[PDB]
Amino acid sequence: NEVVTREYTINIHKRIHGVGFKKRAPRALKEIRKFAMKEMGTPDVRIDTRLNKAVWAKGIRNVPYRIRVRLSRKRNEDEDSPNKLYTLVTYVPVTTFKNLQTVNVDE
Amino acid sequence: SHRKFSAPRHGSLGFLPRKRSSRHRGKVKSFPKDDPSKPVHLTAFLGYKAGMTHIVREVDRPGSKVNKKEVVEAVTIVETPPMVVVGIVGYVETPRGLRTFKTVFAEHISDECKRRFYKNWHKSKKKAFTKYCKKWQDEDGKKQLEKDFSSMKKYCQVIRVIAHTQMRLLPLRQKKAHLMEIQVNGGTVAEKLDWARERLEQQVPVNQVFGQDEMIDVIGVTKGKGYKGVTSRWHTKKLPRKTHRGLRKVACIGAWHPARVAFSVARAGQKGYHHRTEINKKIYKIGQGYLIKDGKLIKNNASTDYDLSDKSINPLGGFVHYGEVTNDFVMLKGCVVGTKKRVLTLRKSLLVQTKRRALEKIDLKFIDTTSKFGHGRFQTMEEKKAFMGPLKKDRIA
Amino acid sequence: VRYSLDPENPTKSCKSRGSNLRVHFKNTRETAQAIKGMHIRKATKYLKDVTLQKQCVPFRRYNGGVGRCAQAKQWGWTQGRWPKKSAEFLLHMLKNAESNAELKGLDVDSLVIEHIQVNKAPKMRRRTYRAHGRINPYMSSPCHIEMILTEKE
Amino acid sequence: SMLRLQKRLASSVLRCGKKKVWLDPNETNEIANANSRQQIRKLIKDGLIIRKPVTVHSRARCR
């Protein structure tokens, strides 16, 4: 429906390839923001502070290669904002990234 | 006064407006001269640059130092699936040049050809040539069409065949086909016209257009470099280290008194993406593609009668930035303009090859299929895994 | 007060002006020339497209040094930009105009910009500091804007 | 709202730096209506303003 939640992994390495040292973690964050927008369709994505910490975990220029996030399109009926659907992006800690599919998670 | 030390001209003035090419394909601009004594044939073809590798052959050059010894030569691989003739244009020569008299297209033109006719195939209704194939299937339109054929026979002097490449057989992202006019040579106009309308709606292979170990010409668009300065663009001498407003310049552009910068001094601008026509490119081998008789077979590619292995022309990990060759290919000697995936016009020579450097039958001993994605050291996967034995993933498998 | 080009019918027209507005006169004049003649809904959607950089303002007269844009081929030309401040000032004036139209009781869904002009305002003076103890002017170029919309469908 | 005065005044009554003063991000209104010492002191006693511990500079490596 529209209260949906999935789990993705993002290849920050190929989304970050080539950018300057003092720009890699901010570039990674707006790459995540664009990825979340395009996987959903909603503007107003909100990046969780733990996800911000995970992106910035090794400083500004050694960003992790793959990140495991949970996207969740949720209702916005708490502010009278022009769009009724926002997307919260949270951070999923994992050990390995092998054989990890995109998975719909339950309520 | 008197530049005090002779140095030749930097760069060539026979090659300039040194601007971006207005086309991506590569126009022929000169076909071979027609003599009706020859059989009817085509004179050009359209391939795609896959990549480079190198070969080993034994040279038969009497008097040369490498006579009856083995050399290594770089080659370029051009994938050439057969071209579909779908149209035919005729030309009449006038005192103003040579103008197109009449084109005739065929019924049932393919969707990649119509993709060439459209600039946005996604939003289109794909309506091209529908009213035309209507007049092909009609009977009033049919007598009109043969009347056009008969008028072309009695008036035209130069006929050409409109053929497109079929991009569904290529590993490329592009689905839009490439069309081309290929001159038909060797006969009377009636003879070549019935020959071409026999070949209408049909496939023509590079085996039928070209042959083994002949020298052809390659026409294409030089690899693109962008806006460059005079040191990269014209190879002028760099100025000394203590030069105030820049080193990579030309220090003087003309004298005082022609009072203008001439067209012949070196300036910064576009380098590359240039239309070039290189000649005397020797064909080393014409491939055969991936045929299926049974459990299929790819040795008809680089099996060279002195190795007898079962390897294709493709290296390990495929051709870098191209894909893999599953169609008929052409192996040329040496380097060839353009990027990988760049479309190359290939045409017959318009000189006569009487040279012992030319008219030479070659015979390959070895074709290198190591990986070009690094310093690859194995020819085939079987050779690699037989040299290394079982691995950890193989063992757990 | 005293508009240039009084309308044909001052019962089916509505007008709006604004003076001493701190937007660039040249950018706003190009935006005004792009907006002239449009319907009011099309003009609002276009100016919001400008502020989101989906449609450009073609720079035709005050075009020296202005870069080239693929969106000028609609208004077939080569130079275009996206004046944000000009777009928002014109949107404020357009909504004031539709407010005047609904106040005097006209069909707001059938108004067309019949007249729009941009005049220069008096300049406001600031300073800049230069190399050998010099001080140069740092003036602003504000503008008066006026527009007259007209009921016609 | 704006807690610059409260940050400065808390650093004063806690005898530390403004880098060490922690203001509760949820009780922003109750902090914001505190224009005095003894109001800052009340907030410290009820735990809405906290002095933060020093970031550790260990000597285990050099030992």
Add this chain to the structure above:
RNA sequence: CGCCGCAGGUGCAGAUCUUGGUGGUAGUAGCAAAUAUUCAAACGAGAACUUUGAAGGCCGAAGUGGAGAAGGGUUCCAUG
């Protein structure tokens, strides 16, 4: 203001004239010395820049720290 007389600090295109105003240049040059920001929330009509929290960083005690003398004179502090 016209006519008869009378009297001039009495006629401008210039003087690198003087004072004032305005152009083209031109929406141009430019807003590039000292490593760096990011996420969320709040207030608010309005947030890249305010405040709060979290993170990542810098000055690194011959400091971008804490106090003074000259000098400044209210710049200090709250509120709007």
Add this chain to the structure above:
RNA sequence: CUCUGGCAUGUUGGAACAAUGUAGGUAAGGGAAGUCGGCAAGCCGGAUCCGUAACUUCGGGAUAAGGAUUGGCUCUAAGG
């Protein structure tokens, strides 16, 4: 490089990564052929153990020149 303390990158941001620049690197084989001129860059560099020429105002020259060693870990002696 870090702690206490302080800050928000030095009067703006975003997107790209052409030429020419400015600042910083690297470079096969040669090794000053470059240039007015080795300009600029590079080489050398700390410490320990050896070993140090002409000349001299006998003080110096002198770190002359030249050579070797240098990490980690486990011990053994000697020095209150």
